[PDB]
Amino acid sequence: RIPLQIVRAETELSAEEKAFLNAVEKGDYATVKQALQEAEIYYNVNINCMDPLGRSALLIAIENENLEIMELLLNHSVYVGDALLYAIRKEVVGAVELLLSYTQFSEFTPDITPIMLAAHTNNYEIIKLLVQKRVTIPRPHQIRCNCVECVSSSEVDSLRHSRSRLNIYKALASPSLIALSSEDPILTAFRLGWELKELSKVENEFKAEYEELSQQCKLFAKDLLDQARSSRELEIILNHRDDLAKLKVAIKYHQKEFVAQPNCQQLLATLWYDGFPGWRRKHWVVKLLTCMTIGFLFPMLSIAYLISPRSNLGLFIKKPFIKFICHTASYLTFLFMLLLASQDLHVQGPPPTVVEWMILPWVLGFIWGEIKEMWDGGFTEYIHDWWNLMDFAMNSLYLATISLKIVAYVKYNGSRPREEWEMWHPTLIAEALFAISNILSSLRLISLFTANSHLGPLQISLGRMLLDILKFLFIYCLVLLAFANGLNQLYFYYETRAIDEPNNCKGIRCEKQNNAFSTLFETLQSLFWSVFGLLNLYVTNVKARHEFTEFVGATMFGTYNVISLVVLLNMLIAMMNNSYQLIADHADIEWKFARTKLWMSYFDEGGTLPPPFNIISLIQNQHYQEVIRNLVKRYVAAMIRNSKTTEENFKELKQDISSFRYEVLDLL
Amino acid sequence: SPSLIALSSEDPILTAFRLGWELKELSKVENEFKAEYEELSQQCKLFAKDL
Amino acid sequence: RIPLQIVRAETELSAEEKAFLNAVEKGDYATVKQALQEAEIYYNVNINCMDPLGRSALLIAIENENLEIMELLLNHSVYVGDALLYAIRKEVVGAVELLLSYTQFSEFTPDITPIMLAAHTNNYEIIKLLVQKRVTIPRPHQIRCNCVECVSSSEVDSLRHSRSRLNIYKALASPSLIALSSEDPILTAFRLGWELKELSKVENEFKAEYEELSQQCKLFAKDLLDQARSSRELEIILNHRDDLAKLKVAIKYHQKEFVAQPNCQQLLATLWYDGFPGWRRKHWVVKLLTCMTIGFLFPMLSIAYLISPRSNLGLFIKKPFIKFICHTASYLTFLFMLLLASQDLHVQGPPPTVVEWMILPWVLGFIWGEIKEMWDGGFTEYIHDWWNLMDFAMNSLYLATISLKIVAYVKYNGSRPREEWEMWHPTLIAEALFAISNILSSLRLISLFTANSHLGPLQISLGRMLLDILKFLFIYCLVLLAFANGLNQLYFYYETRAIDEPNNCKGIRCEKQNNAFSTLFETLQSLFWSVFGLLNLYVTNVKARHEFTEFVGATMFGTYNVISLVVLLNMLIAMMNNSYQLIADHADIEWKFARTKLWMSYFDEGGTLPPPFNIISLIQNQHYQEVIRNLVKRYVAAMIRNSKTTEENFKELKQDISSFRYEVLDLL
Ligand SMILES: CC(C)CCC[C@@H](C)[C@H]1CC[C@H]2[C@@H]3CC=C4C[C@@H](OC(=O)CCC(=O)O)CC[C@]4(C)[C@H]3CC[C@]12C
Ligand SMILES: CC(C)CCC[C@@H](C)[C@H]1CC[C@H]2[C@@H]3CC=C4C[C@@H](OC(=O)CCC(=O)O)CC[C@]4(C)[C@H]3CC[C@]12C
Ligand SMILES: Cn1c(=O)n(CCCO)c(=O)c2c1nc(Oc1cccc(Cl)c1)n2Cc1ccc(Cl)cc1
Ligand SMILES: Cn1c(=O)n(CCCO)c(=O)c2c1nc(Oc1cccc(Cl)c1)n2Cc1ccc(Cl)cc1
Numbered sequence A, C: 001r002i003p004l005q006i007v008r009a010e011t012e013l014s015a016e017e018k019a020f021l022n023a024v025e026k027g028d029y030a031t032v033k034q035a036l037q038e039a040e041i042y043y044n045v046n047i048n049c050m051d052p053l054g055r056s057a058l059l060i061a062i063e064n065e066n067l068e069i070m071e072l073l074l075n076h077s078v079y080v081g082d083a084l085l086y087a088i089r090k091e092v093v094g095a096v097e098l099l100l101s102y103t104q105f106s107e108f109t110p111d112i113t114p115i116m117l118a119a120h121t122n123n124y125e126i127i128k129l130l131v132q133k134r135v136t137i138p139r140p141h142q143i144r145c146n147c148v149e150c151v152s153s154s155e156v157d158s159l160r161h162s163r164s165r166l167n168i169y170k171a172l173a174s175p176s177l178i179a180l181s182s183e184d185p186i187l188t189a190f191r192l193g194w195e196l197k198e199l200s201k202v203e204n205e206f207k208a209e210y211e212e213l214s215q216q217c218k219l220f221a222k223d224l225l226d227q228a229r230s231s232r233e234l235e236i237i238l239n240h241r242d243d244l245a246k247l248k249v250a251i252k253y254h255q256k257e258f259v260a261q262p263n264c265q266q267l268l269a270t271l272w273y274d275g276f277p278g279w280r281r282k283h284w285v286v287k288l289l290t291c292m293t294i295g296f297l298f299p300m301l302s303i304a305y306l307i308s309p310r311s312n313l314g315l316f317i318k319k320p321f322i323k324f325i326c327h328t329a330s331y332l333t334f335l336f337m338l339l340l341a342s343q344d345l346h347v348q349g350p351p352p353t354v355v356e357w358m359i360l361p362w363v364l365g366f367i368w369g370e371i372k373e374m375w376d377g378g379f380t381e382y383i384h385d386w387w388n389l390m391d392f393a394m395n396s397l398y399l400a401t402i403s404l405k406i407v408a409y410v411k412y413n414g415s416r417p418r419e420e421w422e423m424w425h426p427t428l429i430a431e432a433l434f435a436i437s438n439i440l441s442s443l444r445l446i447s448l449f450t451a452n453s454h455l456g457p458l459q460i461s462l463g464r465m466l467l468d469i470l471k472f473l474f475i476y477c478l479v480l481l482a483f484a485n486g487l488n489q490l491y492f493y494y495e496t497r498a499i500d501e502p503n504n505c506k507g508i509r510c511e512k513q514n515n516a517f518s519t520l521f522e523t524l525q526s527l528f529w530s531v532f533g534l535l536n537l538y539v540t541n542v543k544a545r546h547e548f549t550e551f552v553g554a555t556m557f558g559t560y561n562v563i564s565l566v567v568l569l570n571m572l573i574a575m576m577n578n579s580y581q582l583i584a585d586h587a588d589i590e591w592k593f594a595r596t597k598l599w600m601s602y603f604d605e606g607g608t609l610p611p612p613f614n615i616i617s618l619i620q621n622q623h624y625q626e627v628i629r630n631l632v633k634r635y636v637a638a639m640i641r642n643s644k645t646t647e648e649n650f651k652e653l654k655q656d657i658s659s660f661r662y663e664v665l666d667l668l
Numbered sequence B: 001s002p003s004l005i006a007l008s009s010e011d012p013i014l015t016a017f018r019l020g021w022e023l024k025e026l027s028k029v030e031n032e033f034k035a036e037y038e039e040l041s042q043q044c045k046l047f048a049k050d051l
């Protein structure tokens, strides 16, 4: 048997103290009033007594939404400490106003204040009631603040400090508290969400709560935008300056839902097709023919802009869709010339051919455009693209190609056959660099999948799965290096000279593979190519009759195969499946954000000419304020409607019925 | 509206068919509001199936 | 503009007919009574008038659970047609009893009867009330009935006949209607679920409804078993004869949930470990050592059973777990001898060796056991196993091996080297058949994964994914045959003799592959081996300088590769993923059903000795009835509790409040 008793005992209620609490719970006004009047004379009942759940009479009255009994208790001067917090959490309008007009256990932490709790509940009525007075919320310090107060509070009590900061940010991120008491709710939501995301990054713990607060602020901004009812209002909102200034601010703060708003996208599309008014309703063949015709005429449009920008053709290229088509056509012609560039080879450092002479201005235009973007946009914007890295690599490789071509031209004159050229001859290195540059240039077309409806979200999904690929890369590389070390340690004794080989060819790229694991570099390459099955098995064989050594090397190779293919590759497939399922829900919003960035990149005057042709306030604030007031009214009404459209509800219904019953019985 | 088609419509089935077809075409044409037109068309199709 | 009007018009209510209906809806008893009394004198209000929704006054009263107004309307002799059906569907006790004691539009089909609708609602109170009278439900005919009435009804109105049959089976499959008015609820549920599954198979349409009705019956049987509270009751239930007779009947009807009942499994486990009382609580090492010791002593136990079955060792093998261990050990020794059988080869038809002489009695025992199982169990039970197919194949291959060995022994005496033997020499065919038999025998161990907790559900999952594999097999084979036909048609002109080959070797199994597509059989094999990458590319090359033909053949081969690998194999992976996710929820129940079948296979006296040693009522009904009565009471109480633990509820609350309000106002 296990005896069961009360380990942590408390003070039990008296027989009367229990009858009085039961009367309060049942809502019988007459008996509660009689008990209150009798307590003043006889002092037999403690009006502040708790219950087995810790609730006093006032807390019971508040929880039952019994305003009459509550007010009766207040008129008898019962203990009221922290009752306002319970009234605010209960989200009952009557309790606050009643209570507003006037160390025990508490369900609320000491740092909770009435306005902070009201902001936590996100109840517009109670928040407005509290803001009607003079209430304040403490300002949180910097995310990486190092003042004496912050470090002192962190060292004295880290839990209390973290809880207080989280409560403050929960209060500030309240959509209702931003709807009121905020000059610019949209900008406030943007910057508050950004700061909450930064806190989520910094705070390893409480990361989920800061993430959800930031997401809540983002959704509040998106809903405020949703309340717009006319194009005039939407233009006023997006063009406000603290064109499309506020849209640019939203893009800066990574407000993807706000940018992907259907009305925002519709306005951006009307700006995107400046020239064509009816591009929305056209057939596939008509659109394709128009795109082909505009692309084939890109040199004409560029020349017209160069000569006279003010004409039917001079300013026709400044239109965003037309400019995009011209740049894409220019890049396509550049790639076509790159393909044609491989259609006498014994000359050491030959002069550039006609195709190379045509290619050169495109490379110069690419470099000039990159440096112009760096000079104009800035440094942080240039490095935030993450596509400028490939552009920088292409430009550097092209510059190295040109330098090596010049070196080979001015250092060699004779025509020696390539068979006897040096391994590190300048022409060979230049050609290798040019080939790598061609690969990168042709691969640069991936960034244009954003402009397409069918290819955009797919590109987003593949880009976000590249992160899982990168994560798997580390473990694969560790395994690869481990087995490379083992195989090299085992096999480096039997290294053979190239002369001994049947065709004077040494390594794994010969017709008969040999010396697969003789050196660490060759071992790494061999383990790489065994992933694709191009490494033959006999490479695990040695000329000496060391069958144990051969078997051990073969077993190492087989274990590497088993891991890298059976275990690691299937785990990679599983990770990709999970990540793609996770990111399939938000593909459209991310794609629309990326496409908005692409479209806005073509809104600027600078960079109008594609290569190689590039080398040749009070009233506005008042309008914004009135639009914001209308949006806030509409948002508040809509959210109240949505919330209107628990066991405590049934408890309140029972309380109302019982109070009515007791009143009727007393009257009769 | 399924109720507004149940009333004030000579042939509710044909009305639902053609209205759903037109809503699908609008969903194609209207790049934005695509989900709403898709759900309206699906609602008309379900109304025909329930009839 | 689109004019909107009422296409299908109706008869509008009068001003009074609307006020009277509104009074009925609000529950005002006094005004309804006054209107009813005034209608008898003035005949100004039609008491049977409908509303815009088609409901009459009685239907409104029933829908609001207003028994007083309902009874008032009944006392005034209002139209009552089909009101009982609405009362039953509403699941209100008062309406039925009231109505029970006493071609317009209807929400119920003409074939619906009060008892049928009550059974559809599965409401025990109303079903019991209706069964208290003399009510009947029509008997559905055979699933494949061909009588004149069935075909006449099907031809006259297929929709009506199908609807009537489905309604009847919905009525009969009611758990409450089976709890009452059924001699044996468990057997009734088993056979009714089986018949519903058969109907689901036969009825291509309405398949989902019959499937869910069958599943509902299965769950009802499982819940009835769940209500058992002691081992005596469970034994009485499982041992009832219309041992473990009812358990066998459940297994016959594929009642997987009933068999996988935790109490059923616990009883089956206590039977399974007859010898060991405390096998449940033992360490892994102890269990493994005990299993090894029992397995290594299987010949001793078999001999002891053969000599004296009545001894500490004679009857120790009749225990189910011990018998299973002995049979498994016997099969393992047989496989060990098969492995040893490959440790002078020029003799044509040699006498069997010592290992073959030891193998022979095991084969004879296998054949004798198979034919004994066929003779005892029957034919349908033998073919329902689906594992007896592999056993039959093994036995046939072994018999063919023995026949060919005898033929080669009695037809050849000389010792000729194998190099110059005939292609179809009897010894070679016998050896090939024996090797195939060895493969099948070793693969037969898959069926023992059922006995294991970790390997059982995995085997179930793999077996159920074999169905998706089989489905994909048809499309793969169609593609394979198509491309084989194309490649053979293209390449059969350049067929070359084996002499012309460098090593006199023709086909794809040579060191230098040749004639890959010369014949249809070889083309099929080549397309098979290209799936695994073992077909080299140069097989698409011909000696003649027909570069167009070579390119076309290479393109056909490449398209076959693309389909079969990129498209078909990934689609197979996707199908397997979906099927495995689908069947992962029910893996445990299916595994427990399979393991119960395996355990019960070792409960019988027959087949006790493994190879090769096999070749050397009223009171029971009363107890079952009382147990079933207790189970039905408990099940009814539990299901009512579960159901107790809609907008119509709020409508009823409003109706009650309004009726109380009107009564109080009238009284005051
Ligand atoms: C696919 C293989 C054969 C290589 C093809 C090389 C190029 C000819 C292809 C590859 C990617 C294609 C581009 C992919 C993305 C688009 C988006 C597309 O924009 C639209 O979808 C119309 C709606 C809009 O963008 O406003 C314009 C065509 C373009 C630039 C394509 C032009 C032709 C490209 C450059
Ligand atoms: C795995 C490779 C090395 C081939 C092994 C051949 C056999 C030695 C293995 C393969 C499958 C094994 C069997 C798989 C299933 C079981 C279930 C197992 O039963 C239990 O799990 C204990 C609980 C119970 O069954 O009552 C008894 C061992 C046995 C027969 C195993 C015995 C050893 C087997 C036959
Ligand atoms: C990692 N690996 C490997 O490198 N080689 C190459 C060796 C050089 O030829 C294997 O051949 C191999 C293998 N794994 C295997 O199958 C298992 C699966 C589970 C456990 C164990 Cl121990 C083995 N094999 C097959 C094999 C089974 C039994 C025997 Cl006796 C000998 C070979
Ligand atoms: C089905 N198939 C195939 O059988 N062979 C073997 C031919 C015999 O050597 C291919 O080489 C092949 C291929 N598919 C491909 O890539 C696409 C992808 C989409 C559309 C098209 Cl048209 C081609 N290639 C590569 C290739 C691309 C362009 C050119 Cl010009 C020539 C070869």
Ligand SMILES: [Ca+2]
Pocket: A385, A387, A388, A391
């Ligand atoms: Ca750039």
Ligand SMILES: [Ca+2]
Pocket: C385, C387, C388, C391
């Ligand atoms: Ca069998």
Ligand SMILES: [Zn+2]
Pocket: A141, A142, A145, A146, A147, A148, A149, A150, A151
């Ligand atoms: Zn600070």
Ligand SMILES: [Zn+2]
Pocket: C141, C142, C145, C146, C147, C148, C149, C150, C151
């Ligand atoms: Zn019939």
